[PDB]
Every structure is written in C-alpha cells, then in structure tokens.
Amino acid sequence: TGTSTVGVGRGVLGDQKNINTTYSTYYYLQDNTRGDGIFTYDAKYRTTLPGSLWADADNQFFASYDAPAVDAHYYAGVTYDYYKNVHNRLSYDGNNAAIRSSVHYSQGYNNAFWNGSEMVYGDGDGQTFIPLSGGIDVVAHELTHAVTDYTAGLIYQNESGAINEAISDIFGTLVEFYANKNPDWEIGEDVYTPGISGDSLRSMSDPAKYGDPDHYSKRYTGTQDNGGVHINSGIINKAAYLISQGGTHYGVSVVGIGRDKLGKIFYRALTQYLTPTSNFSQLRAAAVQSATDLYGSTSQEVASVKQAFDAVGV
Ligand SMILES: N[C@@H](CCCC[NH3+])C(=O)O
Ligand SMILES: [Ca+2]
Ligand SMILES: [Ca+2]
Ligand SMILES: [Ca+2]
Ligand SMILES: [Ca+2]
Ligand SMILES: [Zn+2]
C-alpha cells in the first residue's frame, strides 16, 4: 500500500524511460496504473521465487543492477497496453490479474520463462545472452504464455506445443511492432549474442536461417525439446509471417494482409477456437474460421490464410 509515483531509469540497452512505482518508505517497482498492478521482484541470483519486491531509496534506477528490473517492469506495461488497447483484453486472464516478474534469476542463466504464475528472467552469461528482459519480444513472448494458458490451454508437447510457442513468437513480435522501436520479424535479437551483430534465436521471416523448419515436410518428429516445440514453431511462424507480409514460398504465392489483421485473426483463433490438444491442421481450421468471422468467407483475408497454410504444407 502506498502512493503512485513516477521513477526514471535506464534499461538493458541503455535507453532512459519512466516507470510507474509506489512510494511507502522506499520506492517499489509496483505499477498501480494497469489492472491489479504490475510487480517486479529481485531474485538476487537465486532460484527461490519470486524473491523480494524491488525496493529503491530514491526512485532513480540508473545502476547496472537495476537495468534488467527497469525493462521487465516497463515492457510488461507495454505488453499490458497492447492486449488492452488492441484486443480489449485486461491482463493475461481477462480480469486484470496482477502481472509479476522476477529478474536476476540464478547465475549465468541463459533463458526466461513463464512458470505458471509469473515471468522469470535470467541475466545471461554475457556471451550467449545479456539480461533477457532487455528484449521486448522476449517479455511479450513470456507474458503471452500466460494468455495462452488461460485461454486455449495448448499442451506444451508436440504440435500443440509448437502452436503454443508460435503464438508467443507471433504476439511477441506484434508487441515489438506496437512499441515501434526497431521492430522486425526476428526473436530475441536485442539480447542474444552481444558479440555478434545481425543474428537472433529464431526467425519468423526465414526460420531455416537458424535450423528451424519452414514446411511441414521438414517437421521434427523426435523427443528433444518436448517434441520440438521451439523447432516446429517455425512452420507456424512462417505461415503467420506470410499472412501479414506476403510472399511466394515453395512456389505458393500469398497476398499479405498486414500485421493488424494477422493479430486479429490469431487472437480470435486463440481465444475462441483452439483447445489444449489442437494440432496444425486444427490451427488452420481455426484461423480460416476466425478470418471468416472477421472479414467474411469471400474475403481476401480468408484466401490469404488458406494460401499461407498451403505454402507451409499444412
Ligand atoms: N527459450 C528457448 C530458447 C532459449 C535457449 C537458451 N539456452 C528454450 O527454452 O528452448
Ligand atoms: Ca536508486
Ligand atoms: Ca527488434
Ligand atoms: Ca524481434
Ligand atoms: Ca547478437
Ligand atoms: Zn515460449
């Protein structure tokens, strides 16, 4: 309990931004402006969660140790705004659930995750990753898992799990475009491999660039990565890219319909048609139905959904 205040800080990539805080003796990373609040915690290099609600003596967040917290807090706010403004959705559950994030998780931890209840961000080892909350697509990817878990409930294995992952990359990217800094169709480029320019974890525009399939005939069928959830997601990421941006892929031509309509179609599919066990063929059907609901059965939008899924062999 305290009074809402506005702090200032520097994020992982060195940019200054304002952050919404709460004052009660200390200034806490607690944003009361969005739903039931956005709360950012210090995990203090340990794996106990959530850790301590982030406290600061002066409401200025320019220390090196502060940067991952500033970005986890700020980009959760951006993500909240995207869902509210674009999709009329109030937080991940649709009922303004509090959004909780922990930073400084463990030592040298080269990942981030939604744990069923909150977001968690490693600092990276400084070679593979820098602190992972520095990437707006990463923050939005993880918070999108919460959305999925409350809605379609896609099981984290095999084709359902690859859809789960792709939904997170799709909305992660749409949020990155909403914020409009340096948007692209790549995943994690701002925090991956600080020694190497121009790479990323995954690509939506060309998944094969990083060894991921861009066609159903190239799907991974083994047991690694929960049946390739971060690998086979490339097939869906490519379809989504094609629906938005257009192109000819394996000789199948897709007329792009743009990002806003992509987001509308997939948000509707996610929230009205997908189920925990949906597979790729079922996703196609859900996307075709959603586009039909939104734009009509004779629409270009529907035609493009069908061409995009044809192009990737679904
Ligand atoms: N988030 C992906 C890629 C990160 C790999 C980090 N070492 C995964 O959990 O598989
Ligand atoms: Ca301070
Ligand atoms: Ca970018
Ligand atoms: Ca990106
Ligand atoms: Ca890099
Ligand atoms: Zn994920």
Residue numbers in the entry: 2 to 315
From the paper:
ARP/wARP was then run for automatic model building. Both models were completed manually using Coot interspersed with refinement with REFMAC5.
The RoboDiff forms the core of the services offered on the ESRF beamline MASSIF-1 and, thus far, has been used to mount, characterize and collect diffraction data from over 20 000 samples since September 2014. In all three cases diffraction images were indexed and integrated using XDS and reduced using AIMLESS.
